[PDB]
Amino acid sequence: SNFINIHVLISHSPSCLNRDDMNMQKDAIFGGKRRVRISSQSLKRAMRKSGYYAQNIGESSLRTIHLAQLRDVLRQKLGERFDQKIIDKTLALLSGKSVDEAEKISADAVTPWVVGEIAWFCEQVAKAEADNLDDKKLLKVLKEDIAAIRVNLQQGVDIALSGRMATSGMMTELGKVDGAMSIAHAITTHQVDSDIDWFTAVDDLQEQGSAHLGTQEFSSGVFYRYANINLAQLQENLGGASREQALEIATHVVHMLATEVPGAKQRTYAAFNPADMVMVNFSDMPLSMANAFEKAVKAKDGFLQPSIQAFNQYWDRVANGYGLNGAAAQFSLSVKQMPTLEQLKSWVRNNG
């Protein structure tokens, strides 16, 4: 089985975990009913910026469009390994932009960068001009072993998982990455009519009334999180890593998808809720369980119990109808049953 599907049902107390241009909760129509939504990009950034990622996976990539500021970072970080001239040309070749001393140098678009990957490149650049090898032929040489470049993404795994594109520089040819992880926007299993908080700000120098009156949207919600990992693609994106290496990374994603919650509005709403159900399943074709909630879940002693129940019933329907028999395990607080998340994670680590 090449795919690892991950299914999370997580319930949040009143909160505003993801909002749009007018500070209103993100949402989506599913089954003709409004669902509160948390974007996949919000989930991915919450994971890559988390402590768990830092401890168990490593450094998240540097995503920026400001090459002049990037230039100065690399000079401070790669200074004791390379001379300033080589560092500047490396960035210039990769970005396709003239790296001089300008206060503002801008890339085509926001781009993820990996210092370790840039460090690997300037070695080649140094050896290139040393061997009197020009840039046009340098590119031709580097295109012949992209796997040797992708080994550097072990220092920037979030790129191996989520991908990268570039439209200028050598990154166009050498830095094209198709992410190994697919992830959906988290949506509530049920209909939500959002609440509105009418607030004031009391002014200590104003005795009559308040200095500001306002409204803020918020709600609760049981959310369905889905993601899968393409193991073969993850290995290729890491320069030819082993399946055990890919499986361990997948296991950290499972953990983060069950525990990591976006930080937005959490200082004043504090919805720090862990998942109540996690389900992992190996398959040959990616399988989302979203249609378990296409008919919006009606409340019955809460939304959580009928959501989990709806999930289980639809899982059986699909398995029985499509004859699916990939390995599967399920952890719950409310198919191999796992009492703890840790046992569930060992299971995944051991290829199911």
């Binding site: 007018m22 500070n23 209103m24 409004r34 009519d193 959002s194 509105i196 409204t215």
Partner: protein, 150 residues
């Protein structure tokens, strides 16, 4: 066939203090269904016809901000709601966005808060016509009228 908007406006205006207070303390349009005074107000305007019910709920809930918050002014189309909210010079553009983006019932709640703040002078039958349909088109025209005024 169509709700007499000015007649309803007058009926609300010369309503006794009791019936008026019973309607005003409502917190959302559907709660008007619990108020006896509400039914007597809208009965001669076609309430028993289900076609008119959602419109009458919106109209009266907007009026329920107070007898003196919406001031009708005759045409010289006439002043729309969007222009009238901008004319007050009290309403931030961001609050108009939040209004026109809001879903059901919540939109009427936010609208009434805006009426309370703005105390608009407008063409009431024109606003009632807007409240009758209240489709996506009407909500975008509200925002664009507000912006075109400022």
């Amino acid at each position: 066939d169509e709700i007499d908007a000015m007649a309803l406006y007058r009926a609300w205006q010369q309503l006794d203090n009791g019936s008026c207070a019973q309607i005003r303390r409502v917190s959302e349009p559907d709660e008007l269904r619990d108020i006896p005074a509400f039914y007597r107000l809208v009965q001669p305007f076609g309430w028993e016809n289900p076609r008119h019910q959602q419109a009458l709920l919106r109209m009266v809930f907007c009026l329920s901000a107070g007898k003196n918050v919406i001031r009708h002014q005759d045409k010289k189309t006439g002043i729309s709601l969007g222009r009238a909210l901008a004319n007050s010079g009290r309403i931030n553009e961001r609050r108009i966005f939040q209004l026109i983006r809001a879903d059901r019932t919540a939109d009427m709640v936010q609208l009434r808060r805006l009426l309370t703040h703005a105390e608009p002078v407008l063409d009431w039958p024109l606003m009632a016509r807007m409240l009758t349909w209240w489709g996506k088109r009407e909500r975008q025209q509200l925002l664009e009228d507000f912006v075109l005024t400022t």
